[PDB]
Ligand binder design. Structure first.
Ligand SMILES: *[C@@H]1O[C@H](CO[C@@H]2O[C@@H](C)[C@@H](O)[C@@H](O)[C@@H]2O)[C@@H](O[C@@H]2O[C@H](CO)[C@@H](O[C@@H]3O[C@H](CO)[C@@H](O)[C@H](O[C@@H]4O[C@H](CO)[C@@H](O)[C@H](O)[C@@H]4O)[C@@H]3O)[C@H](O)[C@H]2NC(C)=O)[C@H](O)[C@H]1NC(C)=O
Ligand SMILES: *[C@@H]1O[C@H](CO[C@@H]2O[C@@H](C)[C@@H](O)[C@@H](O)[C@@H]2O)[C@@H](O[C@@H]2O[C@H](CO)[C@@H](O)[C@H](O)[C@H]2NC(C)=O)[C@H](O)[C@H]1NC(C)=O
Ligand SMILES: *[C@@H]1O[C@H](CO)[C@@H](O)[C@H](O)[C@H]1NC(C)=O
Ligand SMILES: CCOC(OCC)P(=O)(O)CCCN
Lengths: 403, 407
């Protein structure tokens, strides 16, 4: 069968820390490729995924891409891009080789710029995708006044900058905007001083333990307070200087975590004929010794996006592929238009794009005694919030008031 | 015997943010003719150019960097223009053991040896304004300086460097304010905090907005001295902008007496450099090759740096003198060119060419003061030799510069 070549760009080496994402998603990639080949979905053709190690480095990643174009087969599209700086370099140059790219792990909001990255698509929601979800949560609990606590690092300031636009023209006031680089204590005292009750936090795992330490000292916890912070931290992240562990857990009690949903909770059959639960069992059996990755479902759905894209492209050509050098502008535009049509139910829920960006599911968690517990989910397509009954809790008789 | 051809892989921005390639490509073409016609530089070698239009865009440049590296003949050096293009090529370069030599990059971030191990530039870093600033502060006795910047990576980095420079000189930064587009709040704070010596870093559009706000707040006069980059258009404060409230007269008033620093790009002296041209002769020569007038030509003022980049490379290759055996998988020749480039010391059309440890060009700075709606040359400063040429052309209302505080 003639091959439909795809350029797989990801860190795979054990030497690179982000190689765990690349390797952790490969059993999921193998599962989708195996099924698509068995069903002969791409008949007469077959999906030819070639893997090239980017090593999570700008120079090595660029050479890996360059070597793939020079010595590799004629790739129709790019699959991957995990590390933010490497993905940005490749994504910006795509048009030069008329290559559409589909990432499953690059979450940097920068990539949503279609003036800079027109040929880039992603199955994973970006770091900013938590903002329309937070707005829905604030509306649901009648929280009209908020305070913000942001770590002065690009990754976090990007999220805080996006929040301004999301809360604009909405009946929500950001009464206090506070930033910090190394110590949040000064900013936490200012928030307390301005009587902030609902805090929207954007900071790393290391800074979070410092934030909650300052929160305990300033009594910015309990029935009167609601902390809404990142939901992507390592489990038992707090266990890993002035505060006590019991005092940290007391201030942490009831915080709301926000992050993308790794897999759909709906027991409905997906495009492959399996429910997300059935695919998850298949993935866990296949992965064997390889450690699991939260991007596995996004990589799995990614292969289905490519296969469905190539099908639509094949039909468009027949309505009127082998000689695709990177010179064919028209085919690149056909693939680009075909990918914009993506609309199917996958393992991560409904797979649909809005200007290259994924309209997905956002998970809401709550720290309860010893761990984060799921309390709800936000559907980006329908812009709806579903809060799980008898899970979410408040220390008071009512959820806190915003003033 | 026959001369061996040796290749430069260059990128010229013919369009984009800095269309410097328009005047820089002919300047490079002239410099190659000059080096190749001299039998005392590379008699065994012929320096040849293979180039592409980067459009001052990293994405666009990524396509051409591939074209330069993956097509015969083998290139011995890479020559990008724009800072954004140089950041991409200088970081990637280590994978092909290539020296990178920029003729137009000013970004302070490019003077990082960890990210850019084989990088050199005949265009100085934007941080070159800082030793001139510290020297003017010391001469005038100021130890308290306020800083105002537009939010751009270049300005953030320039002010970061100014901090470590002031500290060594026993000067401190009192207040630091920033703005993305509107400078109303940062300037109001400068008046509130009673700032006297202010360093302002912004582009032309933002400069007009800063100075309108400066008029409305009476932040000009005997009490105040403004330090700006001398890169603005001829009568910038007079230029019509419908976004600003202030009149031409009110604004010629707000800018009065301010100091500017500008990187010297053409030797003001009438001396003859290595090519045996004068600064004035080079200009006449370059104007002839151009299809359009210098004013219409992008990178005309930076053109001497592109001319000098070719000489820096030629002299470095002459030191090493072999060249045809260069391969992308071998460090040997690269390390030798590197050592020769690092040891560069010659007179060019832009002045004396030397690189610091970071590979960044060391040059003179032109110090000017705005006296009666016109810039007047008040001196020059050489950061390396610590020598200030004073014109005795500067003027103040007090008959002497004011002071940093209340007194
Ligand atoms: C560096 O710079 C100047 C460049 O001179 C000028 O500028 C160029 C941009 C271009 O326009 C060019 O055409 C122009 O000359 C050089 O200085 C010149 O050097 C020449 C050579 O010495 C001088 O000419 C000599 O003039 C004397 C009389 O003064 C003659 O005696 C002599 O003539 C010679 O003598 C025999 C007689 O049998 C002749 O047959 C020979 O041809 C021989 O040349 C020369 O004609 C000229 O006067 C100088 N000009 C100035 C202004 O100084 C300088 O040499 C360059 N350096 C280099 C190339 O290293
Ligand atoms: C890119 O796609 C958008 C959205 O397409 C729709 O949603 C997809 C998930 C899929 O179900 C498609 O069949 C849908 O059409 C296109 O914008 C739509 O264009 C149609 C006109 O044919 C119009 O009826 C809709 O209102 C548009 N949707 C929005 C949100 O404006 C867009 O035209 C596509 N661009 C291309 C192909 O260049
Ligand atoms: C080139 O090298 C030779 C010998 O190594 C030296 O004599 C000559 O002066 C050099 N050329 C220049 C222009 O410095
Ligand atoms: C668009 C402006 O670009 C410049 O500054 C970027 C930091 P550059 O450093 O790329 C060119 C400056 C030429 N004197």
């Amino acid at each position: 069968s003639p091959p439909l070549s795809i350029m797989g760009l990801m860190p795979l080496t054990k030497e690179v820390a982000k190689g765990s994402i690349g390797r952790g998603v490969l059993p999921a990639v193998e599962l989708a490729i195996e099924q698509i080949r068995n069903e002969s979905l791409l008949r007469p053709y077959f999906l030819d995924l070639r893997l090239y190690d980017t090593e999570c480095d700008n120079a090595k990643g660029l050479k890996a891409f360059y070597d793939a174009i020079k010595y590799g087969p004629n790739h129709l599209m790019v699959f991957g891009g995990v590390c933010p700086s490497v993905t940005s370099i490749i994504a910006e140059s795509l048009q030069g080789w008329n290559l559409v790219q589909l990432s499953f792990a690059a979450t940097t909001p920068v990539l949503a710029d279609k003036k800079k990255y027109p040929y880039f698509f992603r199955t994973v929601p970006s770091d900013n995708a938590v903002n329309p979800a937070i707005l829905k949560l604030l509306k649901h609990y009648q929280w009209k006044r908020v305070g913000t606590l942001t770590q002065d690092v690009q990754r976090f300031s990007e999220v805080r900058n996006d929040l301004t636009g999301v809360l604009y023209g909405e009946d929500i006031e950001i009464s206090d905007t506070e930033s910090f680089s190394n110590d949040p204590c000064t900013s936490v005292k200012k928030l307390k001083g301005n009587d902030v009750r609902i805090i929207l936090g954007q900071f790393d795992q290391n800074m979070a333990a410092k934030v909650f330490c300052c929160a305990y000292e300033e009594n910015m916890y309990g029935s009167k307070y609601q902390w809404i912070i990142p939901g992507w931290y390592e489990p038992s992240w707090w266990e890993q200087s002035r505060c006590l562990r019991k005092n940290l857990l007391a201030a942490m009690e009831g915080y709301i975590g926000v992050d993308f949903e790794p897999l759909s909770s709906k027991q409905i059959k997906t495009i492959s004929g399996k429910t997300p639960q059935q695919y998850e069992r298949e993935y866990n059996n296949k992965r064997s010794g390889v450690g699991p990755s939260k991007f596995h479902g996004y990589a799995y759905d990614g292969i289905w996006v490519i296969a469905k894209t190539l099908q639509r492209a094949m039909e468009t050509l027949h309505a009127s592929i082998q000689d695709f050098n990177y010179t064919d502008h028209t085919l690149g535009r056909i693939i680009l238009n075909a990918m914009n049509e993506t609309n199917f139910f996958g393992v991560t829920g409904q797979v649909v794009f809005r200007n290259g960006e994924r309209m997905g599911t956002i998970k809401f968690t709550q720290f309860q005694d010893s761990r984060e517990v799921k309390v709800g989910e936000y559907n980006a397509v329908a812009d709806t919030l579903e809060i799980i009954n008898d899970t979410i809790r408040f220390q008071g008789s009512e959820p806190p008031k915003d003033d | 015997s026959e001369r061996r051809a040796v290749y430069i892989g260059a990128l010229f921005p013919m369009s984009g943010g800095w269309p410097g390639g328009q005047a820089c490509q002919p300047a490079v073409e002239m410099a190659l003719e000059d080096v190749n016609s001299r039998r005392d530089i590379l008699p065994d070698y012929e320096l040849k150019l293979i180039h592409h239009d980067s459009k001052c865009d990293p994405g666009q440049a990524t396509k051409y960097l591939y074209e330069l590296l993956y097509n015969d003949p083998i290139k011995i050096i890479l020559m990008p223009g724009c800072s954004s293009v140089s950041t991409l090529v200088a970081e990637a370069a280590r994978m092909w053991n290539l020296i990178v030599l920029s003729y137009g990059s000013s970004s302070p971030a490019l003077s990082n040896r960890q990210r850019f191990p084989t990088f050199f530039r005949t265009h100085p870093s934007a941080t070159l304004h800082n030793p001139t600033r510290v020297k003017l502060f010391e001469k005038w006795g100021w130890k308290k300086i306020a800083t105002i910047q537009q939010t751009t990576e270049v300005f953030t980095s320039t002010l970061d460097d100014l901090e470590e420079r002031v500290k060594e000189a026993g000067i401190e930064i009192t207040f630091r304010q920033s703005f993305f587009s509107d400078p109303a709040v940062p300037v109001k704070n400068l008046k509130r905090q009673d700032a006297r010596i202010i360093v302002g870093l912004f582009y032309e559009t933002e400069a007009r907005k800063v100075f309108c706000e400066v008029y409305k707040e009476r932040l000009f006069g005997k009490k105040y001295v403004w330090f700006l980059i001398g890169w603005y258009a001829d009568n910038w404060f007079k230029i019509y902008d419908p976004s600003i409230n202030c009149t031409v007269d009110e604004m010629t008033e707000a800018v009065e007496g301010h100091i500017t620093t500008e990187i010297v790009m053409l030797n003001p002296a009438n001396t003859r450099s290595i090519s045996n041209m004068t600064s004035q002769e080079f200009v006449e020569k370059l104007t002839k090759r151009l299809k359009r007038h210098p004013e219409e030509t992008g990178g005309f003022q930076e053109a001497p740096l592109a001319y000098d980049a070719i000489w820096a490379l030629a002299l470095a290759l002459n030191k090493t003198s072999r060249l045809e055996d260069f391969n992308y998988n071998n460090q040997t020749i690269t390390d030798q060119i590197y050592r020769a480039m690092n040891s560069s010391s010659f007179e060019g059309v832009s002045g004396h060419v030397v690189f610091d440890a970071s590979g960044s060009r060391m040059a003179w700075t032109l110090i000017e003061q705005l006296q009666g709606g016109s810039y007047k040359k008040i001196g020059y400063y050489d950061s390396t030799k610590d020598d200030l040429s004073w014109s005795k052309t500067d003027k103040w209302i007090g008959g002497s510069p004011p002071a940093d505080d209340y007194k």
